[PDB]
Write a protein that binds this ligand. Sequence first.
Ligand SMILES: Cn1cc(-c2ccc(C(=O)O)c(CCC(=O)c3c(F)cc(-c4cn[nH]c4)cc3F)c2)cn1
Ligand SMILES: [Cl-]
Ligand SMILES: [Cl-]
Ligand SMILES: [Cl-]
Ligand SMILES: [Zn+2]
Ligand SMILES: [Zn+2]
Ligand SMILES: [Zn+2]
Ligand SMILES: [Zn+2]
Length: 197
Amino acid sequence: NGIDCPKCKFSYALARGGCMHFHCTQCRHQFCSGCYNAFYAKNKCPEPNCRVKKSLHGHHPRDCLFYLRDWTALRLQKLLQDNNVMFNTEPPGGGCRVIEQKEVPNGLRDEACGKETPAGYAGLCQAHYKEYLVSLINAHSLDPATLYEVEELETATERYLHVRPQPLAGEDPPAYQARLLQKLTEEVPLGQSIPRR
Ligand SMILES: Cn1cc(-c2ccc(C(=O)O)c(CCC(=O)c3c(F)cc(-c4cn[nH]c4)cc3F)c2)cn1
Ligand SMILES: [Cl-]
Ligand SMILES: [Cl-]
Ligand SMILES: [Cl-]
Ligand SMILES: [Zn+2]
Ligand SMILES: [Zn+2]
Ligand SMILES: [Zn+2]
Ligand SMILES: [Zn+2]
């Protein structure tokens, strides 16, 4: 459970306000609560091959919630299903039961999310159900690339390998697809600070 600041290792409550940014008020580190990579202010990123240095950003692995939050729950579910990882669709105007950080820290009672709870999202709202799915995905180290289209695979290859890939002479789309995926998985690890098992 919880969020550890990757710099000073102070433990925080696993409490994401719909946002991946986390600021350690102990040591002032700024990092992604999804992959524990540093966040950088504009022009501050010290990575020499960074192509977005003028932007406020961090560098995320492809299985960070930063990215996978943008998937549909259906597709996330597909990744889990394909790997025989079980998840809830049902709970065991109340709204989402995830308890968030209280607006008043010394408050007595917990504050539930309360948001709309889609049918089949296990009594969670959309964002929280997705976060749940991704925690399962990350826990079992599932590779989202396994479900990429060729376009996604090209994106990923440029992003993580810094090469623009192109089909070979007489390479069909399936063969091209499998070639990009093979190299991606072979050369680019999943999140290295994402908690596993
Ligand atoms: C002060 N500060 C905040 C940030 C920061 C950087 C990134 C994100 C992020 O989650 O991407 C956030 C969280 C707040 C935010 O702007 C935000 C967002 F940009 C996108 C999303 C989002 C995108 N898809 N689904 C949700 C949610 C957010 F809360 C905040 C950096 N500095
Ligand atoms: Cl919100
Ligand atoms: Cl990607
Ligand atoms: Cl990483
Ligand atoms: Zn810290
Ligand atoms: Zn991240
Ligand atoms: Zn950068
Ligand atoms: Zn919720």
